[PDB]
C-alpha cells in the first residue's frame, strides 16, 4: 500500500564526482529505512540504517540524510569499485533501485575470433565466437562477414558487467551452424565499429589455416 | 515541545472494560513508539506492553498478555489502551510513555498517568466525626485536635480549618481501605487554653457526592 | 562476525513445495538481539521482503500478504538454523532467494534493517530436467584464449582457472538463454607471448546441479 | 524475565553529602549486539517520574553533573555528589535489554534530623459515635524521626491484633518528620464490656514503650 520512487532510475558519473540519489516515500519515518548496495552477483550490502546513522567497516563517503517524504543519498566521491545498484527500504517495501554507473575517457576495444574446436566439429555443428573486449561505451556495432556476405538472425550476443578495476565492459558473439554451413565457405570474418576506433577494424580467417 | 496529557480518573465496576486515552503533542507521532507501564503497591512499576507506533506490531509483556490490549488512532495521533475483567487489585495508576532514540535512551517522556480503582460499592457520602481530649487531657500546654472521616467512597476528600485558617499544625493522613470503604482522619495541635472567642471548626469538602460538612469541635 | 551458509535445491517443477535451509554461524538462532528474515530478488519485479520470524517467548511469525497461506518460516534451534518452506509454486515464483538477519532489535521494537545477508540461492521453476554441459576450448592464434560451456541446466556455474592459480583478466560472463531452453557462457584471458611456450593452463567447470567437475586443458593447435 | 531488587530500600541522607544506590540484576542484561542498558528514574512526589540517566555511563540532557551511574555485568551503582530539596523521591533503576522490560522496586530519599520523641494522644470514640453502632479508637504518634515504630492494642490488659490500620505520612516540609495514626474498629458490645482503653508505642527515644492509658468511667 505503499509505493516508493528512486530518482533518478539510472545514473552515470565520473571518477571521483559527488552524486546524490533521492527516493520519495509517501508515508515517510527517516527511522525505519536503510540503503543497500548490491553489485551483481553478490548479496545486497548495508550501508546506512535509519536514514542518517552509518554502518561501521563501508567507508564514510557514503553519508545519507534528510527528512520528511525526501530521502537522499550522497557520495562525497566515487571510484571505480563502487559501481552498484543500490535500493532504498522503507521497513516493507525495496525500493525499484537505481543503477549507477563509473564514467572515464573513452577506451579502445580489443578483438579476437575464434573458430569453432574440432570436438565440437565431432559433434556435427560449429559455433564461432568473437571476444570484444575491454572497451567504452557499452554500444558496440559488431558485424559478420562470411564470404563478403552479411548474416544475422542466428547469432547471440551477451554482455558482461564492467569491471570494477579499469572500469570497462565486454562483449562475445556465438554463431551456431551446421558443419555443412562451415564447410560451405572458405574465409570468416568479424567486423566490429566502436567510437572508440577511428576506423572500422575487421579480423578475416580460413577455415584450416 | 514534547507533552503527553492522559485521561482523567475513573472508578469501575469489577469485570467491567475501561478505556484509557494518551494524547502526544510536539512531536511526529509515527517516530516514536509508546510504552505502558503499571504503578501499584502490590507490585511497583511492571511492565505493559509496547506499541511500534509505524506499523502496529505489538509486543506485551505476558502477564498481561490476555487482561490488556493497545490501539492507535494515527489520525489523531492517541495511543489507546483496553483492558477487560478488571479484578480487585488492579486499582493501580496507568502511564502512557514515549520512547526515544531508538538505540540510546529507554523512556524519554511520562504522561501525568491516570488512576483506575475498581472497588465493588457505590458511591458514598463522608461521614465526619469529631475527637477532643477529655476532661483529664488539660495537664499540659498543648493538646491534639482532630476529625476523622469513615464510610466515604471514591477518593479524594480536602479537609479544611476555619475555613482553611488555621493552616499550621494540620495533619491528615493518606487514605486507607477496609470492609470496601475508605477511610482517613485529620489532626491539629493547638494550646489548650481555649478562648470565648477563639473556635475550632473543620470542614471535609467532597465532590464526588458533592457534599460538605462542617463539625462542632469546641 | 556472524557469518550466514544457505542450501537447498536449485531446480524445483511447478506445483509442490520447495525448501532452503539457511544455515547460521557465529549467533544463536534463538537470540533475543535479532530477527531473521527471507528476502527474494526477482529481476521482472524487484526486491520484496517475503516473511519474519524471531523469539521472545515462543516462536513468532510474520508474512507478507503477497506470499500469505503458502509460505511457513520454521526455525531450527537443534542445528542452529531456520528454512523456508513454500507451497503450491507458480512459475511466478522464479527467483533468487536471499536469508538475512534483522538488525537491531532493541526494546521489544524490530527496526527493519538487515545486514548480514547469506550468499543467495537462486530457484527456478520447470519441469525440465537438469543435464550436463559441454566444454570446447578457443585456443587462438598474440591473443587472449579460453574456454567455453554450452547447453548446460540449470544455473548456476563457477568458471576457476589453473584452480583459482589465476584470478587477473580473466572474465566470466552471465548466462543466456538460447532457443531449445538452455544456457551457456565462456571465459577468456589474455596471455603473454612467451607464456604460451611455458605456462601450463587447464581451466575449471563446475555444475552442482548435476555434481559434474571438468577440467580441460587449453593449447595452441599442434598442426 | 530478570528480578531486580534495589538495596538499601530507603536513604536517609543529609544535605550535600553522597548517597549511594545500587541496582543488581540476576542475569547478565548485555545486549548480544552490545553495550548495556540500564536507566535510573526519579519520581518527585505528586508528579511524573523522569529519565535521570541512561546507558549506565552516560548522563541524559538537563540534569546537572552531581547524578552519575557505574558498574558492568550485574552490579550497577548510581552515586549524588550533593543532595539538594529536589533530590527527594523514589528511585527506579529499569533496564530494556530482555523483553520483558522489567523494573526495579523504589529507593526513597529523605532528609535525616535528631531522634524526636512522638507525642501520643488517645481519644474516645465520640458521642455520636455511641448511637451510630460503630466503634473507632485511635491514637497519633506525632511529630517524630522514624517510619521504624509499632503500636499495641493493650485492652484490659489483653492483647489483640485485629482492627488495626496503619498510615504513615510523607516528610514534613519544615520540620522534616512523620505522623501515625493507629484506629481500632469495635462493636457497641466489646466497648461497654471494656474498661481501659490503651494503645503502646516502642520507639527509639522512649527506652520504656509509651502508654497513654484512659478509663471509661473517667469519660
Known amino acids: 500500500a505503499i509505493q516508493l520512487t528512486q530518482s533518478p532510475s539510472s545514473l552515470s558519473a565520473s571518477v571521483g564526482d559527488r552524486v546524490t540519489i533521492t527516493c520519495r516515500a509517501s508515508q515517510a519515518t527517516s527511522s525505519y529505512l536503510a540503503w543497500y548496495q548490491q553489485k551483481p552477483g553478490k548479496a545486497p550490502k548495508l550501508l546506512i540504517y535509519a536514514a542518517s546513522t552509518l554502518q561501521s567497516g563501508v567507508p564514510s563517503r557514503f553519508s545519507g540524510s534528510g527528512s520528511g517524504t525526501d530521502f537522499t543519498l550522497t557520495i562525497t566521491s566515487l571510484q571505480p569499485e563502487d559501481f552498484a545498484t543500490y535500493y532504498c527500504q522503507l521497513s516493507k517495501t525495496f525500493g525499484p533501485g537505481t543503477k549507477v554507473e563509473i564514467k572515464r575517457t573513452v577506451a579502445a576495444p580489443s578483438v579476437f575470433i575464434f573458430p569453432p574446436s574440432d570436438e565440437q566439429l565431432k559433434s556435427g555443428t560449429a559455433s564461432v565466437v568473437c571476444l570484444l573486449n575491454n572497451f567504452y561505451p557499452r554500444e558496440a556495432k559488431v558485424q559478420w562477414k562470411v564470404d563478403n556476405a552479411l548474416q544475422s538472425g542466428n547469432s547471440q550476443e551477451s554482455v558482461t558487467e564492467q569491471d570494477s578495476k579499469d572500469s570497462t565492459y565486454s562483449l562475445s558473439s556465438t554463431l551456431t551452424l551446421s558443419k555443412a554451413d562451415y564447410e560451405k565457405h572458405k574465409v570468416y570474418a568479424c567486423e566490429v565499429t566502436h567510437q572508440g576506433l577511428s576506423s572500422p577494424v575487421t579480423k578475416s580467417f580460413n577455415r584450416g589455416e | 515541545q514534547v507533552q503527553l496529557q492522559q485521561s482523567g480518573p475513573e472508578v469501575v465496576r469489577p469485570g467491567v472494560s475501561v478505556k484509557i486515552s494518551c494524547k502526544g503533542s510536539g512531536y511526529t507521532f509515527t517516530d516514536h513508539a509508546m510504552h505502558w507501564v503499571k504503578q501499584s503497591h502490590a507490585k511497583s512499576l511492571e511492565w505493559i506492553g509496547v506499541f511500534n507506533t509505524y506499523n502496529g506490531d505489538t509486543n506485551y509483556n505476558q502477564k498481561f498478555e490476555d487482561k490488556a490490549t493497545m490501539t492507535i488512532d494515527k489520525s489523531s495521533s492517541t495511543a489507546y489502551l483496553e483492558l477487560a475483567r478488571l479484578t480487585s487489585e488492579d486499582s493501580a495508576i496507568y502511564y502512557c510513555?514515549?520512547?526515544?532514540?531508538?538505540?540510546?535512551?529507554?523512556?524519554?517522556?511520562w504522561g501525568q498517568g491516570t488512576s483506575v480503582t475498581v472497588s465493588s460499592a457505590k458511591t458514598t457520602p463522608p461521614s465526619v466525626y469529631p475527637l477532643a481530649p477529655g476532661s483529664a487531657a488539660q495537664t499540659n500546654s498543648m493538646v491534639t485536635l482532630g476529625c476523622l472521616v469513615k464510610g466515604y467512597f471514591p477518593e479524594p476528600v480536602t479537609v479544611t480549618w476555619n475555613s482553611g485558617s488555621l493552616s499550621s499544625g494540620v495533619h491528615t493522613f493518606p487514605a486507607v481501605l477496609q470492609s470496601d470503604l475508605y477511610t482517613l482522619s485529620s489532626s491539629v495541635t493547638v494550646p489548650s487554653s481555649p478562648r470565648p472567642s477563639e473556635t475550632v471548626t473543620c470542614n471535609v469538602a467532597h465532590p464526588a457526592s458533592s457534599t460538605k460538612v462542617d463539625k462542632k469541635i469546641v | 562476525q556472524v557469518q550466514l551458509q544457505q542450501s537447498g535445491p536449485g531446480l524445483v517443477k511447478p506445483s509442490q513445495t520447495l525448501s532452503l535451509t539457511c544455515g547460521i554461524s557465529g549467533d544463536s538462532v534463538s537470540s533475543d538481539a535479532a530477527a531473521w528474515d527471507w528476502i527474494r530478488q526477482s529481476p521482472s519485479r524487484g526486491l520484496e521482503w517475503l516473511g519474519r520470524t524471531f523469539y521472545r517467548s515462543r516462536w513468532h511469525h510474520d508474512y507478507s500478504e503477497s506470499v500469505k497461506n503458502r509460505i511457513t518460516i520454521n526455525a531450527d534451534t537443534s542445528k542452529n538454523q531456520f528454512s523456508l518452506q513454500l507451497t503450491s509454486v507458480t512459475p511466478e515464483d522464479t527467483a533468487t532467494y536471499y536469508c538475512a538477519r534483522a538488525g537491531v532489535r532493541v526494546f521489544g521494537i524490530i527496526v527493519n534493517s538487515l545486514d548480514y545477508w547469506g550468499q543467495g540461492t537462486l530457484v527456478t521453476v520447470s519441469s525440465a530436467s537438469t543435464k550436463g554441459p559441454s566444454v570446447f576450448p578457443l585456443a587462438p592464434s598474440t591473443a587472449a584464449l579460453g574456454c567455453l560451456v554450452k547447453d548446460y541446466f540449470p544455473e548456476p556455474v563457477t568458471v576457476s582457472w589453473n584452480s583459482g592459480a589465476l584470478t587477473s583478466g580473466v572474465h566470466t560472463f552471465p548466462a543466456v538463454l538460447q532457443s531449445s531452453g538452455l544456457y551457456s557462457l565462456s571465459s577468456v584471458v589474455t596471455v603473454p607471448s612467451s607464456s604460451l611456450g611455458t605456462q601450463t593452463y587447464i581451466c575449471n567447470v563446475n555444475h552442482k546441479p548435476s555434481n559434474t567437475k571438468v577440467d580441460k586443458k587449453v593449447e595452441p593447435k599442434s598442426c | 524475565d530478570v528480578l531486580m531488587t534495589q538495596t538499601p530500600l530507603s536513604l536517609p541522607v543529609s544535605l550535600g553529602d553522597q548517597a549511594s544506590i545500587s541496582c543488581r540484576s540476576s542475569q547478565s542484561i548485555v545486549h548480544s549486539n552490545g553495550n548495556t542498558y540500564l536507566e535510573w528514574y526519579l519520581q518527585k512526589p505528586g508528579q511524573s517520574p523522569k529519565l535521570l540517566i541512561y546507558?549506565?555511563?552516560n548522563r541524559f540532557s538537563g540534569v546537572p553533573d552531581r547524578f552519575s551511574g557505574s558498574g558492568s555485568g550485574t552490579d550497577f551503582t548510581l552515586k549524588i555528589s550533593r543532595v539538594e530539596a529536589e533530590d527527594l523521591g523514589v528511585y527506579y533503576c529499569?533496564?530494556?535489554?530482555?523483553?520483558?522490560?522489567?523494573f526495579g522496586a523504589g529507593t526513597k530519599l529523605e532528609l535525616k534530623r535528631a531522634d524526636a520523641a512522638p507525642t501520643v494522644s488517645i481519644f474516645p470514640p465520640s458521642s455520636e459515635q455511641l448511637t451510630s453502632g460503630g466503634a473507632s479508637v485511635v491514637c497519633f504518634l506525632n511529630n517524630f524521626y522514624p517510619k521504624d515504630i509499632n503500636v499495641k492494642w493493650k485492652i484490659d490488659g489483653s492483647e489483640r491484633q485485629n482492627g488495626v490500620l496503619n498510615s504513615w505520612t510523607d516528610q514534613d516540609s519544615k520540620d522534616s518528620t512523620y505522623s501515625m495514626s493507629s484506629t481500632l474498629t469495635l462493636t457497641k458490645d466489646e466497648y461497654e464490656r471494656h474498661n481501659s482503653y490503651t494503645c503502646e508505642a516502642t520507639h527509639k527515644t522512649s527506652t520504656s514503650p509509651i502508654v497513654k492509658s484512659f478509663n471509661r468511667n473517667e469519660c
Open positions: 510513555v514515549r520512547l526515544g532514540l531508538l538505540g540510546f535512551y529507554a523512556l524519554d517522556y
Open positions: 529499569f533496564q530494556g535489554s530482555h523483553v520483558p522490560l522489567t
Open positions: 546507558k549506565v555511563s
